[PDB]
Amino acid sequence: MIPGEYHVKPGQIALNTGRATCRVVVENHGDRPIQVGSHYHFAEVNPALKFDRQQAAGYRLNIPAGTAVRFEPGQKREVELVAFAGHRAVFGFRGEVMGPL
Amino acid sequence: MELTPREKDKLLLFTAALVAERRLARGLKLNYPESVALISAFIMEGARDGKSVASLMEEGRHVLTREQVMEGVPEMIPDIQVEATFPDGSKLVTVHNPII
Amino acid sequence: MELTPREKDKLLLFTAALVAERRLARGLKLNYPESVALISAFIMEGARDGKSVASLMEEGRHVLTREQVMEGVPEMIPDIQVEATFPDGSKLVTVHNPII
Amino acid sequence: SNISRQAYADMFGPTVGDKVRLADTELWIEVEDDLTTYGEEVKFGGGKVIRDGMGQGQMLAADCVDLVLTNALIVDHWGIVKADIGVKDGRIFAIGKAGNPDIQPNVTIPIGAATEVIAAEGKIVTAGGIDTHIHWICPQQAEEALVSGVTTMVGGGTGPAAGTHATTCTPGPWYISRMLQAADSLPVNIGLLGKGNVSQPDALREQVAAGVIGLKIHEAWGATPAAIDCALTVADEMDIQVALHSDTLNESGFVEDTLAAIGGRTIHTFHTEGAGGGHAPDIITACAHPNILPSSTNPTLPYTLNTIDEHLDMLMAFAESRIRRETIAAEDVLHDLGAFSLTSSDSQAMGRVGEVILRTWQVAHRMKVQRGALAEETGDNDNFRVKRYIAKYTINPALTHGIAHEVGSIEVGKLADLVVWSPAFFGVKPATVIKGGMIAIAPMGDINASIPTPQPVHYRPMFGALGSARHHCRLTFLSQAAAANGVAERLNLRSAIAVVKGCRTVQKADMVHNSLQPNITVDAQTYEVRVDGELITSEPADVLPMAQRYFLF
Amino acid sequence: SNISRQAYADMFGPTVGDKVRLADTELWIEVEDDLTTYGEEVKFGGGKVIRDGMGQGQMLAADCVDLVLTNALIVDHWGIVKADIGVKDGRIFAIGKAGNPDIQPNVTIPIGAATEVIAAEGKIVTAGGIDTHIHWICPQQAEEALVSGVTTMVGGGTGPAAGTHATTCTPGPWYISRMLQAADSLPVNIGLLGKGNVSQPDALREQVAAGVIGLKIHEAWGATPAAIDCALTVADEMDIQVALHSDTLNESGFVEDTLAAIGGRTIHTFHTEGAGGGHAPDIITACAHPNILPSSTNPTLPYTLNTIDEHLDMLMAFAESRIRRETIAAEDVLHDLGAFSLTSSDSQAMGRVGEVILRTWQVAHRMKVQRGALAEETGDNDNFRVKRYIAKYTINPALTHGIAHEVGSIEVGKLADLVVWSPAFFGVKPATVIKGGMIAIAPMGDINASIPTPQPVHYRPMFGALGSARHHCRLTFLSQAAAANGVAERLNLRSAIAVVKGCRTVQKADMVHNSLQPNITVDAQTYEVRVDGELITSEPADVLPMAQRYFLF
Amino acid sequence: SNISRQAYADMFGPTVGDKVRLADTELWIEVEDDLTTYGEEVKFGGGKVIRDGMGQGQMLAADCVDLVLTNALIVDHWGIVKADIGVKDGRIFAIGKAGNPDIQPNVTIPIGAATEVIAAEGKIVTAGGIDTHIHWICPQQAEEALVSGVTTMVGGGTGPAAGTHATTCTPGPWYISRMLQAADSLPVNIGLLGKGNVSQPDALREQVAAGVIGLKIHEAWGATPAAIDCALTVADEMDIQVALHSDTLNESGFVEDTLAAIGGRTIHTFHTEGAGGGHAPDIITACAHPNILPSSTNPTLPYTLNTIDEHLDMLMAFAESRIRRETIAAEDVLHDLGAFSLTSSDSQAMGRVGEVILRTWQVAHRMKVQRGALAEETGDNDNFRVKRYIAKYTINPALTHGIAHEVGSIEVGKLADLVVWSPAFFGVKPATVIKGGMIAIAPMGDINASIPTPQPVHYRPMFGALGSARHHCRLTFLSQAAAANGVAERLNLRSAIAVVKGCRTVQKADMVHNSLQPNITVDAQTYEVRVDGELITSEPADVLPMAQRYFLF
């Protein structure tokens, strides 16, 4: 008996089902660490991250909501992206879109 | 004494620990608030003695064992935190899983 | 601890009883508030131990005798009442003519 | 992307199919539905979802909520579902999926620059409780009740005076006016009851016109057939409720005579079991009638080893005719069956103001232990029993007193009185108490600490309980007549005002999950309670959950 | 039907001929009269008298009282009688026989549906005390005084500032205005005193016009003949009182010079004995004059073993000229003789704010013990001594400051400031303190308890001390000028306002039961006090009642 | 007549040339000037100077001050001088020589009948502190801060909600309005910050128009270049300040990218050292720029033995990138050099609300011990270091937020928010805290005692903190837009209102005694801080003054 304990049923949860995804190799060319959150518009991340920005347009990291991916200096790795939904209107970030797409 | 609000607030914690201390002496298995009060007071006195934060973070895990508290209590206290005036001013002591 | 107003209020009673307990130890004849505090605290601890309301209603009458309190005090306390958390929740304990 | 259900539960709280133990009881709830879109859950924090252009949109204040409770596990009479809760203008805006429509799908609760966030993942959210049997013996009762999770208090009194010690009555225009003015200082919604014991209707109309939302008939002021009839006649006229504490002495007649006087008119019977007052020894038979809304006071909930012993002195020839093991044991079962529809305190007059919620759950626990699953229960969980019991101190009291249009449940348009609980402390010690959209009280650690969590942690009033902020986040209920006569402006009441309505048309069939009208009888000599000839009884608990594991004293 | 006198006393409280010991003192009061009709006493409760059609009538609110204190034993300057007390609109409606005229005889206090009840059988009821020597060093003094039974506080100050530490002065319009505004937050009636030390009348008129009801002349600001004369001239003009703390140093002249400056004009001499300030060592001779209203501060009441010792340091060459065993011993006797007419505190400036009532009774006790019965005493009781002493902190202070038309005694039309006492705790710890018809503070047990009596029981503020309710139940006294200039509206004061009047026409002969003007002398070298050549002295108490039996510390 | 300098110091406090140790630190101040005329000093008391015709004149209220602080030792950014302080209409009237022009020479502060006195001889008087990094997690923080000597609190929050736990943001019009209303209940001046994280300018303008005096950009809501730019554009338009907590994750760019987004516009960087948030690991380089007003939060002040250890958990991969021994050690030195201009708390969100003043002095102490005298120091005293450090929590925070026209220093015309200290308790426990001319809180002994000094002595609220008096003595700061739209009248705010201005034109060169713009660099791998190639570091203290000698816990 543990007060307020959970009885979570075994299994897994599939995230962002039915959404377009794409993988891109990213390399941190900066001298300081960079960490990116799940819903940040990937195409507008820190300029020190080298990758095909054109492919990442309208995408974010396909990872659990609220989590992040870290890139230590010189670190190269492949990440999976998932397309934005809703109105697919991008506002903020580095100010590169500021509108639909 | 010119006691500030925080000093008076800590007097409340000290008194709550006295309650717990006497019940433990009687051989009772402590409940949730009693356990939190007892371990917390222990740390405040450690700070008064001049012990380091690092030392107290460890010592605080050996104040009460699972056999000295009611069932479920260890799980209700994932950690205990308290601040006190060390020789070098106020510091926060966090004791993780204090009851094993 | 997440102490509620009632828990904090009881801490006041506990502390008042500590005052009385030390004076009784010195051999002083207790006054009105000291007597009420001492007997009340005794009952709260009895409830913590798991004693029944019926048992405490009787035991509470043997905490202080007429020779341990000031003149007139027994008559000023026709009864004492206090509530505490028994294993089966909060219960009211009424001790009639606690001092004889 | 995939994530294990355990990791998911730890991160966003449980989802469909997961079960949670309520505190240290044997009651288990199962998440019935989840309104999220897996992968699109909103979480607040550094590098998390609720940020500009991401989970937070570009909409103006008018187009977004003021507050969002993220990933909450709602437990209400209508369901046990996982969802985000949106609050706007002090009221429940929506229950659904929060976020930014610009990049997220299925957003029904827009988060903008004007949105504050309360992280509810792993927490249970319920409506604030409503206690309708308050003796205003002292103002301190309000904070005690608020801390327990009760946000609305209905009752009567003028302070520690003999009349109030015994009855829930605020006598006359002068006292009614003074107490309405004093109410502005309390952090809970308040409605007052006047003295209904009089055989001159005008003396009652005056009180209703002054501000009371109901009238209390108490035997101490004479619960005679003439007084009862008079109070009900005025109640039907002015759309206010009548609360009853009948003639225990059987002086003017027996229970049937009182029932006859009521004449099928709507009435709320206080402590229907009898120990707290009422025709000895069969007032409990009232729950069989369609026009009776029956409630219990809390010292008899649930039946335990020390119950009888403590009751004698709390009472003190008619003692042993009022305190009956037979009716006290049956009461628990009648609650489990839905024959009794509400729970209340009877604050400092044979009742504990901070134990209404706590005791209701202890009864549910004991009933599950003794009787097993309810006939209406589906699945291997106690969801229905939980819905039946939570309704006793939330929606049912609101319906009974004509205030369900304002409070009583987590439904769109209602005042945002919400209580956030950690599962381990459910029903015992809440994490946050929200009054009208603002946190009114919550446990708080060392004020000078580097974080709000260091000891000592105890309940302290927050901004929602301060001056003008408090006035904007609380409601003073008035009768339609008082509101019309401009009582609020005359007394210069500063809090928000609400009017009661629908008190005369509510009946037993309207009590959510508690509409049973049993063929109940009480043996005059043995006091045995029987429903359809079957004996109704239960065993006294020796130890109860939500007790010694949580309280310092 | 018959009933033994003992059973009767236990049921309705004592009646004519019965005696009651006041707390643990040697003072005994005897019930002089009983306004009831045996058999028709009203008692509240289940199956008792105050019920519909029985002890409670059918009259509308306008035709009945709001509150009735049943079977009270009134102790006031005019008598010690048993009666019911009726309160209506916050004021004393009548002292007589309560009930329902429909079935009861001799009813003068009608009880209706709008009537609240306070059971006073077995209790002593007195008017609220009035302390006229308050140093507003901190707001906490108000609750302390209220708890002791003091409902009106007159004084001056701006907080813990040097000027206030030493004098009862609220300097100038700005501070006067700020303190009047702050007064709305305190649960006691308040009147302020300005700084009267100045030789420019306009500087005084400004303060009176701002709101003060009096002016304090204190030696710390220069108690010179010029200042005294100036303050009295303005006082006569504006109908306000002057309080005096004379030139202890004899710098500007001796006591006779000060008396000469006063010129037979009405003045209230503070701590007339001298220890608390005044011409060394003969300021005490002031009580011989017809225009002097003399009061004592409480640290010297009564003369005890530790008095002198503690006074040296509370004081600290002119120390031993100010602290004199001779004058301190005589003071007690002068009170017993009625030469000194008032008692006050001198809060936190050589006086204890919560001990005005307590110390007054200790002096009466010690005087009975040492001197026996008073010449005016009739019967084997201490009724007259009790009337003489209670007047010192009730009616006399009210008369002295021109507020007797509002408070000061239990008389019809006066504000309902009443204190209910249990005989065993009389003068020490009250059962209930009523401010303007509402209970403002009272001892209260566990808030979550099933009844209001479980421990811990300590004084907690009630509804009469909350927000707007408080404003309606308290009075802020203003000078006639301030009231006329519309100060209340300008500062937006929310409490009820009262105006002082009759300060200049009151004289020693008007002090109830304390109008003695003795031919008193003080030896310049020995400091011996003599009245008509006879030496006036007393012995120091080693132990006193109303002390260690009641207090935890 | 002559008097020895020691006797003089004991009687009137120190004079020119005398030195005083600040609490138990190694810091010594030397009286630079004395504005008195030897022999004409004013002292209050029996037989002393301030009396009618003597030190007190015959002028009317309009021609004299309401309050005078006698013989005060002023410690402010402009000097350490001995003088009398005059207060009139809640504001600083003059710093000079008080008395009566009729008989005394050189009187600049006239004392009259309307003048209250606070004896400051032997005491140090300073302006009230200003904390600009407050998380409104609970209302109790106000009393804690006031007791420490802080009279103005700028920040954001709605109570113990997730958003507020992490950021100083009061989200949207509804919450802004509610918090402004709640502010009337707090005894400190208040200004609120809204959520500045949004890329739609209108969503920001709405908040400013609602009442906020600034906008907080926090990474938790997305500290992106787009959001930063948007907030600054609106700030320039509406004359409000922007507070920044940058992108620690380097997600949107590095420190240079953020600096680029700011584009030379005025901005206040919170916890510029980095531990409390900001670009890892070089946010500290911001102090080199002319448009940056840099402040530190207090848990890192000063560097001690337990600092690093406690910070890990108060925080809890980017932990060890945020908590750096290198930058923490350098921060202390940068303060000593004047590179960092303000100190703040970061209340209950990695900061101690009652330790802003205390920690600032501990840093000064440690720096004197490690680095010796400052280059600007003259004489054998630490006067300049004291002026440099006191400016960090008084005038500089006021300038940064556009409120220096109202508060921030002891200068004529500014609100009279003053703190009186006994030298032995300087910076730790104040003797008196004055809000707008009235004592708001002070240590107070036994309420029932014969004097205010007996134990227990603890801080208790005074008249300046009560109801309407409080409203008159506090200020709620509004944006020019809110003031113009009539927000105060709409929300019915009862406190005095003040408007912020000059937020956009203030720059590093304007920070009093702290205008250094060093050529500072941070090594990306080692995190070493260097100014002009020189390594900047310091040693951790094992024991600190103003700690265990003063606190019970």
Ligand code: NI
């Ligand atoms: Ni009842």
Ligand code: NI
């Ligand atoms: Ni009741």
Ligand code: NI
């Ligand atoms: Ni005096």
Ligand code: NI
């Ligand atoms: Ni005095």
Ligand code: NI
């Ligand atoms: Ni920050």
Ligand code: NI
């Ligand atoms: Ni912060």
